[PDB]
Structure 1
Amino acid sequence: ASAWPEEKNYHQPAILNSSALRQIAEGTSISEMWQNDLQPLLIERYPGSPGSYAARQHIMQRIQRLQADWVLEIDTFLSQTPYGYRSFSNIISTLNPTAKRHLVLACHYDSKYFSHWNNRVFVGATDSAVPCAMMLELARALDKKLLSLKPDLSLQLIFFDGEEAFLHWSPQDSLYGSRHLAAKMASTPHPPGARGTSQLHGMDLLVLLDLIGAPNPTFPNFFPNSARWFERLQAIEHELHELGLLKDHSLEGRYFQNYSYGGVIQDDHIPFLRRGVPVLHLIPSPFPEVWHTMDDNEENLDESTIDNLNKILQVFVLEYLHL
């Protein structure tokens, strides 16, 4: 049939030079991210809540003000939960929806459901309000360079709804939005008119951000087949450090360690991984100390660590896109 689905296997980056790295490092404002992209999301936003619709409106609005031609679809669906049927809505933002291949950035925008505890409200700053904000910032910071898109490859953002369990993590109570969107893409022909290939095939690489925002994260390399792209993240961290472009950062405590994890951490990528999508899982091990506590808030975030990772990520995306 069609073998384009193999191009991602042979795709190679266009490594940036020191002058361009500097540019990128200069091009991203951590403090504008914090005010315009991050703070509006630090609300209770479990699926079906008022905050979910708010968070959903804020993500679409911030994406809309940008010059690049983002197409936004709200993939709304119904699914059974421990509390009955409920409605969920994934946010999908795509440049050039026609192109066969797309590099995918994503995270979950729901917050785990938890009634008030000690009069406190769970807002999951690292899980995953910050990954959401890093995605919005990457799109703003790279707006002009992405506008250049009008190799048949472009960029897609996915903000999954319903990553978290409502009552008890299990295969039927978890990954609502990603289980839905992976099965939908696996059976939607791509590109338009194709007779043998799916959108799931068009996913060049799924870069899943989760649990980012704490100090000193250590990201393992999880998969033998995306290991080379993990190595680019290592390389980019190193060079930005040597060029004085990172803050409060030591090579003794670098983010992208040279160690592998022999297993898997259940997350929104599992539905795509099982169907053969390559994944770069940017989740740290161990998890933040504030994981699933009421302390996973704004005050326990580390501003420098997010700034640094924004720069590493933005470099990675431009190098993947040859921009």
Structure 2
Amino acid sequence: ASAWPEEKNYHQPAILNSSALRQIAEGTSISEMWQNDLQPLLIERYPGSPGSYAARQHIMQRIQRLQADWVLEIDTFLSQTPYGYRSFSNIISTLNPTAKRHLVLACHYDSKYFSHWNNRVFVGATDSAVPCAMMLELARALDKKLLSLKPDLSLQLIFFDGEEAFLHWSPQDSLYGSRHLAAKMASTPHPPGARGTSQLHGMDLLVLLDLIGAPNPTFPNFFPNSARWFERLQAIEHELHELGLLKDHSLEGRYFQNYSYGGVIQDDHIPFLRRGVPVLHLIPSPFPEVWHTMDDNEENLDESTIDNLNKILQVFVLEYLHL
């Protein structure tokens, strides 16, 4: 158990400049996101459905066609549920799997099982297709900058499956994808041949996106081992603003407002947190008004707020990686 797993604790960012930041804002397109990356996912897609495979497919296509060398794996597994053994599949996409340290972005790509009602279907526009698209669009924008990876640090995306409960929310029935992936990663030497260090050691920070796409989001600072990273998002939000690069956005309505949170949301991060992974949980409090209703559709998304979180996060992420 060397010392590299503690570098995370001293990692510091490579702050960008007004000129770079300008380049970053102009290099992301919320409309190409909307059509190419997000509209394909707005379909029923609970675990094991045909939706799950169409969306699982859409995702890999969008990643497969970019220049950076993304090592997609599919992590199909079996688990009991209240309706019996079902088959889930997580999507992991790694740059430099051999890099010892990674920064991770993660969301969930299942949609909650619901029966149809008045012939509408639940599709989870904010829970969590926008997150999925955000991530996909971030690899698409930052592609040329992400070739530069050929500090030992790289980037992983993760699209978890079975996040949502099948029937009735509880530890036995939720977060099926993650730990799984947690427990699996916890028990896989890293780097290879390592002897005491798991892939979780190498997880520098896990940025979980969830419930994004409604208007007027407020993200809290949930955890102390990541507060400094949360503060970098505050600073980025503020700068992109002062340079004029955010859209319909005022500071009296920031997204990253410093406000500690009492309790804990259960979400895919809990399997990695209770293994001492640092988590930046970008889930808003309060949830959207359209949470878990058939109105979590596209009509009710805010394109401005997503373009904005996209700029911020893209920036966050290149400064993390010293790119």
Which band: TM-score by shorter chain? Answer: over 0.9
SS of 1:155's equivalent in the other structure is strand
Deviation at 1:117, TM superposition (A): 1.3
Deviation at 1:263, TM superposition (A): 1.9
2:19 is aligned to 19
Deviation at 1:75, TM superposition (A): 0.5
How far apart are the structure 1 equivalents of 2:55 and 2:106?
A: 15
1:154 is aligned to 154
For residues 222-272 of structure 1, the C-alpha deviation after alignment (integer angstroms, 9 at most, x for no partner) is 001100000000000000000000000000000000111022100000000
Q: How does 1:1-323 map to 2 (within 5 A)?
A: 1-323=1-323
How far apart are the structure 1 equivalents of 2:136 and 2:272?
A: 23
For residues 189-215 of structure 1, the C-alpha deviation after alignment (integer angstroms, 9 at most, x for no partner) is 000100010001110000000000000
Q: Alignment length, in residue pairs? A: 323
Specify every segment of 5 or more residues in structure 1 that has no aligned partner in the other structure, as ranges. none
SS of 2:25's equivalent in the other structure is helix
Deviation at 1:284, TM superposition (A): 0.3
SS of 2:247's equivalent in the other structure is coil
How far apart are the structure 2 equivalents of 1:134 and 1:260?
A: 25
For residues 104-159 of structure 1, the C-alpha deviation after alignment (integer angstroms, 9 at most, x for no partner) is 00000000000101211000000000000000000000000000100000000000
How far apart are the structure 2 equivalents of 1:115 and 1:274?
A: 33
Deviation at 1:3, TM superposition (A): 1.8
How far apart are the structure 1 equivalents of 2:274 and 2:261?
A: 18
SS of 1:200's equivalent in the other structure is coil
The two structures, once aligned, show a CA RMSD in angstroms of 0.5
TM-score with structure 1 setting the length:
1.00
Deviation at 1:103, TM superposition (A): 0.2
How far apart are the structure 1 equivalents of 2:76 and 2:267?
A: 20
How far apart are the structure 1 equivalents of 2:164 and 2:88?
A: 12
How far apart are the structure 1 equivalents of 2:230 and 2:88?
A: 32
How far apart are the structure 2 equivalents of 1:84 and 1:52?
A: 17
SS of 2:79's equivalent in the other structure is strand
Q: Which runs of 4+ in 1 moved over 6 A?
A: none
Deviation at 1:295, TM superposition (A): 0.2
How far apart are the structure 2 equivalents of 1:158 and 1:166?
A: 21
How far apart are the structure 1 equivalents of 2:235 and 2:218?
A: 15
Identity across the alignment (%): 100
How far apart are the structure 1 equivalents of 2:33 and 2:16?
A: 24
TM-score with structure 2 setting the length:
1.00
